[PDB]
Design a protein around this nucleic acid. Structure first.
Length: 53
DNA sequence: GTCGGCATAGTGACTGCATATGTTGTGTTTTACAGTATTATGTAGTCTGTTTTTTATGCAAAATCTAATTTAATATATTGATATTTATATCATTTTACG
């Protein structure tokens, strides 16, 4: 039902580095926000990179 | 209310502070499969007694089928006037025949 960090970024237009994407998570730059499974984050299929300011 | 001249009026170019973004490097925390071992699994390889199915006769029940037999029905045989069918084959009308 959810999508892994890589499976979500791979679908993006400008696939950034893993670290950078992980940073948009701690900075709540992604809404709807992703949930932490065990060691990886599983975002939503409709989750988008909300760039504000 | 239009036409003529500096003042309006957002959008675009320009320059450097300010900060999220892009790398590099150390270090903790947990996922993820390989390899041997334990034991209840599902089918396997057969034996055995009960249930199921093929099988070999057995017999009262049922009335046709064949031969003995009698008789109405059928055939021969007359005789002779009168009524019906008869040989061929082109026209005409009824009934069979397939789609």
């Amino acid at each position: 039902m959810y999508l892994t960090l890589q499976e979500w970024n791979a679908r993006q237009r400008r696939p950034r580095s893993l670290e950078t994407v992980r940073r948009w998570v701690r900075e709540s730059r992604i809404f709807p926000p992703p949930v932490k499974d065990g060691r990886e984050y599983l975002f939503h299929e409709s989750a988008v990179k909300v760039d504000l300011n």
